[model samples]
Target chain A: EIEAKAKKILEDYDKQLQHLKKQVEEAKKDFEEWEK
Target chain B: DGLGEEIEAKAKKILEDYDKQLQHLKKQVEEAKKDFEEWEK
Candidate 1:
């Protein structure tokens, strides 16, 4: 149903944001490590 | 309509908020990669 689809889409979007945040943190970690 | 009345409406707003955060993180990733590249040289 429409409600299910809407719920799924929002969850998926949140998931993407979470993944992006983790990637950014790891990327910065690597950059900082190289500076040390 | 149907059962999505308020459910779908709230979902749109939630998705919009997440989109902004996603965009910010993506930009951050780009910068981090750039710095990492510079350190390599």
Candidate 2:
């Protein structure tokens, strides 16, 4: 998607974006607990 | 380290924008769940 910029590549963009959001949420939770 | 961190931060924002877009897509996905083979799986 970055290199080609083709709309076809973004077809699964929603799924991948959701996956990243879940990952970020978990990372954020872990990061907050690191202070403890 | 700084450069990588900055890029990661930028990536996170891009992730957010797409996430916001997924809210709409998710709604459609939900509405079409019954007909979908995987049904948002």
Candidate 3:
């Protein structure tokens, strides 16, 4: 149904955002490590 | 002058794309919920 589709889409978007945030954080950690 | 501009541009692009998708998803969810509630009533 329409509701489920929209709900699933939102879940997918949230997952993507979370993944991106994690990636950014990891990159920051690597940069800090390299500078130390 | 600096490579910062390139990094900024990439970040901006990611933000824009995320915002676009977010807006679209929000509208869809809002509409879906409204329809579901109306049908339930």
Work out the TM-score per prediction: 0.47, 0.34, 0.49
Residues B5-32 of candidate 1 have per-residue lDDT tens digits of: 5665565555556656767877765666
Residue pairs in collision within model 3: none
TM-score, structure 3 vs. true: 0.49
Candidate 3 residues lying further than 4 Å off, grouped into runs, are: A1-36
Off by over 4 Å in 2: A1-36, B28-41
lDDT of 2 at B26: 58
TM-score of chain B in each prediction: 0.69, 0.52, 0.79
Could you give the CAPRI-style class of model 2?
Answer: incorrect
- Per residue, candidate 3 scores C-alpha lDDT tens digits across A1-36 of 977876776566557656656655665555455344
Clashing pairs in 1: none
* Per-residue lDDT over A8-36 for candidate 2, one digit per residue giving the tens place of the 0 to 100 score: 44445556556756766765554444333
Candidate 1, CAPRI quality class derived from DockQ:
incorrect
Candidate topping lDDT: 3
Supply candidate 3's per-residue lDDT for A19: 63
